[PDB]
């Protein structure tokens, strides 16, 4: 399927074990996808003072289209020193590795794979 829906458990930034996917835009976006595969994946949302607390390079979920199912349609942009790899909407959050952490709410999006 072109699009997948998934439930992301959404993370508070101090609570992040793992706090990146990787040290490379290519390898970044891999990870995240692998993740998001496996059911090993979380959600940030970004204010102010969440990026600085994780590891670039980032990996956005970016509206990619205006929801079935209750599920936001979404695509992944990596981010390193201020550039984007991909083109989308409004940021929905940062993805990170999820490693057992309690979530603070649960956020359903249709993932364009
Ligand atoms: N064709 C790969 C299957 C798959 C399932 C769920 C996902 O979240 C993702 I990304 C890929």
């Known amino acids: 399927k072109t699009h997948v829906q998934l439930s992301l458990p959404v993370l508070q930034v101090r609570d992040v074990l793992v706090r990146g996917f990787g040290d490379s835009v290519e390898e970044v976006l891999s990870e995240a996808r692998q993740h998001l595969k496996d059911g090993t994946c979380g959600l940030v949302e970004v204010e102010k003072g969440v990026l600085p ?10 509206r990619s289209d205006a929801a079935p199912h209750g599920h936001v349609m979404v695509e992944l942009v990596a981010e390193l020193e201020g550039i984007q790899y991909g083109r989308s909407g409004e940021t929905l959050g940062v993805l990170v590795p999820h490693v057992g952490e309690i979530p603070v709410a649960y956020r359903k999006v249709l993932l364009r794979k």
């Open 53 to 62: 607390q994780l590891e670039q390079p980032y990996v956005f979920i970016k």
